[PDB]
């Protein structure tokens, strides 16, 4: 198992390397609001985004009827 030196590095096949840290978006439920284009109407949305699985999204449209999409279908 490639181990890690006291300096914060790894040594791979002789060369010294560094595993940088990645910025990402956290899993969770993320709401929104996007002024509509056709009608200039507010309309909200949510989105549930885990590390693994399918994307489940709900919305409120201009017809004022809530809706859902599963696996972005």
């Amino acid at each position: 198992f490639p181990m890690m030196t006291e300096k914060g590095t790894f040594i791979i096949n002789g060369t010294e390397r560094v595993v940088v840290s990645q910025l990402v978006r956290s899993p969770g439920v993320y709401f929104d609001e996007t002024i509509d284009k056709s009608t200039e109407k507010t309309l909200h949305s949510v989105k549930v985004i885990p590390g693994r699985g399918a994307w489940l999204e709900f919305d409120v449209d201009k017809r004022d009827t809530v809706g859902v999409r599963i696996d972005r279908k």
Binding site: T39, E40, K41, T42
Partner: protein
Amino acid sequence: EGGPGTGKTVVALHRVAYLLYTYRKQMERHGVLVVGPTPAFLDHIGRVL
């Protein structure tokens, strides 16, 4: 539902004003649909709206 001689239309219009101010954030991009029996009455409304 009232009757004649009691100003129900003006009252309804003031009511609509109260609502369109209070909840001017869900409305203000939807509108106010006002139906009526005749365009004479509709212009009257538009005139004291």
